[PDB]
Amino acid sequence: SIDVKYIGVKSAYVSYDVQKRTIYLNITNTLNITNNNYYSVEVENITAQVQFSKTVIGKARLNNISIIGPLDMKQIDYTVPTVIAEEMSYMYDFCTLISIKVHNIVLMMQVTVTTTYFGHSEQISQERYQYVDCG
Amino acid sequence: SIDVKYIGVKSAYVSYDVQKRTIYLNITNTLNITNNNYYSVEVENITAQVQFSKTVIGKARLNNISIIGPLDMKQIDYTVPTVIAEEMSYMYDFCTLISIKVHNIVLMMQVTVTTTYFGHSEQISQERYQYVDCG
Amino acid sequence: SIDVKYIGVKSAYVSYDVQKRTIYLNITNTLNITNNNYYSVEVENITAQVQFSKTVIGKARLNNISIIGPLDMKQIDYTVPTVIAEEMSYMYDFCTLISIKVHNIVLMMQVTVTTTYFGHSEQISQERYQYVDCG
Ligand SMILES: *[C@@H]1O[C@H](CO)[C@@H](O)[C@H](O)[C@H]1NC(C)=O
Ligand SMILES: *[C@@H]1O[C@H](CO)[C@@H](O)[C@H](O)[C@H]1NC(C)=O
Ligand SMILES: *[C@@H]1O[C@H](CO)[C@@H](O)[C@H](O)[C@H]1NC(C)=O
Ligand SMILES: *[C@@H]1O[C@H](CO)[C@@H](O)[C@H](O)[C@H]1NC(C)=O
Ligand SMILES: *[C@@H]1O[C@H](CO)[C@@H](O)[C@H](O)[C@H]1NC(C)=O
Ligand SMILES: *[C@@H]1O[C@H](CO)[C@@H](O)[C@H](O)[C@H]1NC(C)=O
Ligand SMILES: *[C@@H]1O[C@H](CO)[C@@H](O)[C@H](O)[C@H]1NC(C)=O
Ligand SMILES: *[C@@H]1O[C@H](CO)[C@@H](O)[C@H](O)[C@H]1NC(C)=O
Ligand SMILES: *[C@@H]1O[C@H](CO)[C@@H](O)[C@H](O)[C@H]1NC(C)=O
Numbered sequence: 001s002i003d004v005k006y007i008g009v010k011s012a013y014v015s016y017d018v019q020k021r022t023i024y025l026n027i028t029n030t031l032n033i034t035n036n037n038y039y040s041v042e043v044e045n046i047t048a049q050v051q052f053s054k055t056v057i058g059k060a061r062l063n064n065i066s067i068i069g070p071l072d073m074k075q076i077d078y079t080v081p082t083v084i085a086e087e088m089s090y091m092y093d094f095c096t097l098i099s100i101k102v103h104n105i106v107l108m109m110q111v112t113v114t115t116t117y118f119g120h121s122e123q124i125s126q127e128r129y130q131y132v133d134c135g
Numbered sequence: 136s137i138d139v140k141y142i143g144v145k146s147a148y149v150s151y152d153v154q155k156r157t158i159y160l161n162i163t164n165t166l167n168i169t170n171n172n173y174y175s176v177e178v179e180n181i182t183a184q185v186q187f188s189k190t191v192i193g194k195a196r197l198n199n200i201s202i203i204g205p206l207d208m209k210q211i212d213y214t215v216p217t218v219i220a221e222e223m224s225y226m227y228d229f230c231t232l233i234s235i236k237v238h239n240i241v242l243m244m245q246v247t248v249t250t251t252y253f254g255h256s257e258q259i260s261q262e263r264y265q266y267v268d269c270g
Numbered sequence: 271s272i273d274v275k276y277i278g279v280k281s282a283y284v285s286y287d288v289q290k291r292t293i294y295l296n297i298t299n300t301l302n303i304t305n306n307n308y309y310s311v312e313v314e315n316i317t318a319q320v321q322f323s324k325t326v327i328g329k330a331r332l333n334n335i336s337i338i339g340p341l342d343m344k345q346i347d348y349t350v351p352t353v354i355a356e357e358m359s360y361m362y363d364f365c366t367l368i369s370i371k372v373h374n375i376v377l378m379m380q381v382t383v384t385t386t387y388f389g390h391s392e393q394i395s396q397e398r399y400q401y402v403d404c405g
């Protein structure tokens with residue numbers, strides 16, 4: 001990345017801003033902007049690139065061979081009982097939340113067992129989070 | 136990365152800002168901006184790049200071979216009972232939260248068993264968090 | 271990275287700012303800005319790069335071989351009972367939170383078993399945290 005910007009409200013190169021209930025009288029504004037941008041990003045000069053994978057098996061006895069990749073979830077139990085017994089009561093639940101395994105952003109790249117790779121990998125995440133808002 | 140910016144409210148190269156209830160009279164503003172940017176990022180000059188992987192097995196006896204990658208979750212139990220018994224009571228739950236395994240940002244890169252790689256890996260995360268807001 | 275900036279409210283190269291209830295009279299502002307930026311970042315000059323992995327097995331007897339990567343979670347138990355018995359009572363729970371394994375930012379890079387890599391790895395995280403706000 002080159003230019004990553006997070007701005008809460010207002011982003012401006014030039015901002016002539018006047019707010020409310022304001023007197024803006026007898027103003028002479030002169031502005032000259034000579035802006036130039038030159039970009040040379042991700043230039044590659046490879047005369048020879050070689051990726052080689054070789055597997056050779058000869059008169060071999062293989063048994064009980066197990067290969068497991070990443071992210072192996074096994075024998076997982078969730079138990080969230082919710083028992084509510086009432087007896088001449090006044091129940092007032094305004095905003096009650098029961099969240100189980102809530103995912104917002106899941107970015108996965110090159111999650112493998114055997115990988116051979118060359119170059120650039122980029123991940124960018126921007127957000128403005130707000131889970132619960134009870135007024 | 137080159138230029139990473141976090142700004143809460145206002146980002147400006149030039150900001151002529153006037154707020155409320157203001158008198159802005161008899162003003163002469165003159166502005167000249169000669170801005171130049173030159174960027175030479177991620178330039179690679181490789182005459183010869185070689186990646187080599189070789190596996191050779193000869194008259195070999197392999198048994199009980201186990202390979203497990205990362206992120207191995209096994210035999211995980213969650214138990215969150217919620218028993219509520221009422222007897223002539225006044226229940227007032229305004230904002231009650233029960234959160235189990237809540238994920239917001241999960242970025243995964245090159246999570247493997249065997250990896251051969253070359254270059255640049257970049258991860259950028261920006262956020263403005265707010266979980267619970269009870270007014 | 272080159273330029274990492276965190277700013278709470280206001281970021282400005284030039285800020286002519288006038289607040290409220292202000293008298294701004296008889297002002298002569300003259301501004302000249304000659305700004306130049308030159309960037310030469312991440313330049314690589316490799317005549318020959320070699321990565322080599324070789325495995326050779328000969329008349330070998332292998333047994334009970336176990337390889338486990340990172341992040342191995344096994345036999346994990348969570349138990350959070352919540353028993354509430356009422357008897358002519360007045361329950362007032364404004365903002366009660368029960369959080370179990372709450373993740374906000376999880377960035378993972380090159381979490382492997384065997385890794386061969388070359389270059390640049392960058393991780394940048396910016397946030398403005400606020401978990402609980404009970405007014
Ligand atoms: C604004 O400029 C004009 C022309 O220069 C002038 O006649 C006028 O009086 C100015 N305003 C005030 C409030 O003086
Ligand atoms: C920008 O404009 C102003 C306005 O008169 C002038 O004086 C200045 O020479 C200009 N600059 C360029 C680089 O054109
Ligand atoms: C890539 O092309 C040629 C061959 O290597 C080289 O002379 C040139 O300078 C390179 N270009 C850049 C932008 O580096
Ligand atoms: C391992 O080998 C034994 C006997 O050779 C077999 O009973 C067992 O099932 C094998 N393991 C697996 C996971 O299959
Ligand atoms: C603003 O400028 C004009 C012209 O120069 C002038 O006549 C006027 O009196 C000025 N304003 C005030 C409040 O003096
Ligand atoms: C910018 O503009 C002002 C306005 O008169 C001028 O005096 C100055 O020479 C200018 N500069 C350039 C670099 O153009
Ligand atoms: C890459 O290209 C040629 C070959 O190595 C070299 O002369 C040149 O200076 C390089 N370019 C840059 C921008 O470094
Ligand atoms: C290991 O080998 C024994 C006998 O050789 C077998 O019973 C067992 O199942 C093997 N282990 C696995 C995990 O399969
Ligand atoms: C502002 O400038 C003008 C012109 O130079 C002048 O006539 C006026 O009196 C000034 N303002 C005040 C409040 O003196």
Ligand SMILES: *[C@@H]1O[C@H](CO)[C@@H](O)[C@H](O)[C@H]1NC(C)=O
Nearest residue numbers: 165167169300301302303304
């Ligand atoms: C910037 O502008 C001012 C305005 O008169 C001028 O005096 C100065 O020479 C200028 N500088 C450049 C570098 O252009």
Ligand SMILES: *[C@@H]1O[C@H](CO)[C@@H](O)[C@H](O)[C@H]1NC(C)=O
Nearest residue numbers: 178180310313314315316317
């Ligand atoms: C890379 O390219 C050539 C080959 O090594 C070298 O002469 C040049 O100075 C290098 N470029 C940079 C920007 O260092």
Ligand SMILES: *[C@@H]1O[C@H](CO)[C@@H](O)[C@H](O)[C@H]1NC(C)=O
Nearest residue numbers: 064199200201333334335336
């Ligand atoms: C280790 O070997 C014994 C006998 O050789 C076998 O019973 C056992 O299961 C092996 N271990 C594993 C983890 O398989």
